[PDB]
Amino acid sequence: KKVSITVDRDPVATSFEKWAQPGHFSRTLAKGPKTTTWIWNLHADVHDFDSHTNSLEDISRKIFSAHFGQLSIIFLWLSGMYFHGARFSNYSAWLSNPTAVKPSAQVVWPIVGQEVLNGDVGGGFQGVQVTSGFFQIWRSSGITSEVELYWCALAGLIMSGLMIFAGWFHYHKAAPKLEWFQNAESMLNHHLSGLLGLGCLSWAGHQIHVSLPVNKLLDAGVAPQEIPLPHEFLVNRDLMAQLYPSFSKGLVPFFTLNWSEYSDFLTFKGGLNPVTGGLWLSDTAHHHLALAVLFIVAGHMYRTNWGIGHSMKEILEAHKGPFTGEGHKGLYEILTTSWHAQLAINLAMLGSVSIIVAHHMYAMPPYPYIATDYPTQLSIFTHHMWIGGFCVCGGAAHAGIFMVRDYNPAQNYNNLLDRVIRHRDAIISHLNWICIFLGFHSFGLYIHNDTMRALGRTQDMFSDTAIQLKPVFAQWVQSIHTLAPGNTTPNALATASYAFGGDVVAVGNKVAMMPISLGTADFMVHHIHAFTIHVTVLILLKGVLFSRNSRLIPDKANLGFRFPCDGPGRGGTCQSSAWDSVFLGLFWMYNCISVVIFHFSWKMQSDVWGTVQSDGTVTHITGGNFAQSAITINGWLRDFLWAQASQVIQSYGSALSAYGLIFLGAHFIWAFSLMFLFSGRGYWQELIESIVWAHNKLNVAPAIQPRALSITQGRAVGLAHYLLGGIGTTWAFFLARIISVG
Template structure:
């Protein structure tokens, strides 16, 4: 006889609408905080609006309400993205020369609008639209109106993109090609191009998958007509990814930090894959788009990595409970934090002295007129033998590991053939030499310093020998009081702040390296990079100064908008130094003297002026520093590449 204890009855309560909300509430500044909602006493109120809008813990302790806010924020963001994309599609339909470009992509330059006489400057979508199977501006209008509901239908690669692109590649006039919905609704149309379509899903369920080899290929390399990956390869790849992710989705779950970090790693890979394996037709010969895509995804990857560190630090301060986490993996990492950080510190010092030491040696030998004593491919060689071995392995892979493939995964591996479309180089093998060895060690140095700062912020977020009770001071705090001299820039937020600058350094070196190397080694528009870039002087003279000539001299040309952006972004960047290089007390005294003058004239406002807090000043400073630096680089790159590419 088995005796069971009676199961407890659970009473489930469902809130119908626990929080009534209305637009008047949302229109009131600071409605989320009782203190801020009272209105401004001092100018700090404006900054608190920015700082605390997303600090849901300070608004309410109701977990359900916090979850609801986060959930609604996701949908708000999605709606903004859809609106933005819809606008881009409408812009392309109304103002671009898409149909003209589609009829002759190798000779007609794409243009986003009819206002500015600039060819080659577009909103970077023609390649994507062609890959989607869009053949007229009317279809772009429909996509814009449907705000991507229709786009999801049109991007169905097997039924729409493959047949339409097969016709386009064969030189069929876009006007003669059946409309996308006809390929979806009429199977006979597809069967004319791909006979196995007549058998439907039977080969799939009978495991006779080779029948689908007509439109799910494994060729490798690039389509010689468009300079992009074979769309049949892409369709096959996406189908395989779906199957893998269906399985993997059940296997892997993550709680915090690492899930975000995987996204960052993928984002940085994306930047490299966009040029080494161009997925869209004619993308590889659109040099401005290629350079922009690489730069864009590198910046995104950098911000996501810093974001991952910020969230890990917030977790440590807000959610970590040392009483329940005894001797688990994180606890053991925290107990070893001194060893981890001191080792990273040593690695950074070693990398810094040695990587820059090689450059300083080269600059010195160059200045003394002793080229035979420099580190270069023609004197003292430092060949990246491991990277060359990896390149060679990938070159040999098609014959060894994938007998069905006719080319390796990317033409950038050694040993492939040049692919040119309409007389422009799309891609060719990219050899590595002494220059790459030198620059990649600079990359390693900058990345390790970024990791050192961010990881120290996470591991010392709750306590340190200097401030044992740091956990009580929250995520961000200033130098906190008279008894604690020398405790500035120790909060977890300050580590994120400092890490952002090193992330900026890291990504800048990467995108400069890419820009110069792909121009000299692949697109062939300037002198050989391997000669100049082994010295710091070469980087300053032959890259930054020489290539800036286009943007500096752009004022009277169709590139003038980039000249203005270049100038304006420099001002934004310089503005940041006002916040970063002067102390809060200086500004408070300055403001108080201005208040005195207002009082003398009896025009003083009721809201009392205050200088920014230390944390606020740093936030404003780093924001303008990054925004100004990124926009300056953007204008510099695009003016250069549109002029020469």
């Protein structure tokens, strides 16, 4: 029983004393401010626990309680989304008429004329149109009334109180010891089996006993208040049998392994529900049940307290061949003693999963009536692409912090890390070459096309009409997925997604999904994507691999993760740290995700979204101009940015005038950021000297001596305002455009 619970009782006293002493957590800051830099230095390093404390136990305790605090904030946020849906929304009107009422769960107060933002969203309601897709989530859950939304808001509030209590309790009353946190096998067993498997299983039970009957009654056309309450499905099996007759047999088919009895509600239909334009909820129920079994089985892999199971260290140490030295030896010790190494992995995975979520949710729209709510589809794609890109760059930020701080060569002799660092010149030179080749042969095709179109030579272009770059591999994969139902997935009835090919799905005379054809423009923008992803990897990988030392600075690890430079010598070593590669790689992340969301926005408006009409023909939002105009830069400038900025710039005096104002405000903030990015600290310190003189003249100089921001903070302020302004401008443009036309 070496996996055991071990707790220190009453470690830290619940006192307001250290609240009154800002900077108490570090020896430098606790002696008080003398310059304004102290103030910035206070906020910058506060959650950097391993810079204040030496011991891994106290660091682990602070992290566990901070995770409860984050959970409390998320639960309060969810409770507020449910409360605003219950109290300030037109959810009931939306349930009666989804394809006509526009969701709105935010109402403004009348103060300075701002009540113009309460536009006519429909259903006898005035408010701000919301695009988070909560209404479709609630309808998929089977909510059907505001009263149940009040109970969900209360459940969120109770959970939020329980998490903030638990964070206090587990830091101040009962803090686990380090040997409790250093149980990776136990934690994985419980998080796979218990967190994921039970979670999937419990959700599958809700879908089978609540979501599936309520939604079958809704899609038959029954009014929401005419639908029986969800517990009458739980007790009276006769009504559930009337909807799905397999329930007449109960749990005998489950236990005797006669599982094909349950095919009424555990289907493998594929495709979309024609009524709602969403995934079949019988498919999602079978999906969650299948995942639950796999996750619970996965949870029995690792050894905890009874001899069955794997040792994770033995698995890692056995995988070594003739190219890779000692192999994965020493990685277990890293990943159970370094929090930063774990955060680097988990941030890269969370970001990757968020980008996958973004792709899978527009192509296989899971919620009822979310496919034809085009503002929601554009919003949730753009949001999860930005979360993915940010989390992916934070994985490289904390890989750099690991290398600078937690990496020790004595325990990493001739293993995989040692070998990567010992051929990092070959890695970065080959990646650098790939980024040059791929920028020439992706963006230079655009420059070739602009020049030929400008010269009158349209036969010399890379286009469908002229020289053709055909995405043959992607077209072939689309063919395979269209041929799959009945062939390589024989029990499937429809394709996984209509994007691959097949029918046009229309809901409320709007296209839910239809095949997304690929041509020369799709080949070109996909290689644009491959190029922007490659260089972002190069900037972040070069920062992680050269974080400790280079040919330039042989002792970079002694300066730390975040230092501004090592002086003007050696020609100049400005921005040589690992932090400065995270700083430079967030710009290239911004560039990559901006072209991805622009590609999505133009391609869906041009070729997928639109209104079905007589004869079955479809009129798209921008009328199929992507194919012949996404091949030049002038086409993107004119037919995408200029043509679609009409709604944001003409929005004044309407309910979308808020987007019109945020468009300008973010354009302003973006420009304001370049003051911090193009300038240097020394100018601003000398300007502050003359302003200090004028304060000295009037005897009003402060005792906290004003300083220009540090070199690193100047870079961080410039990057933060750059990201805010660029993303905010895209946010305002995307939302005003798709609310007006979609």
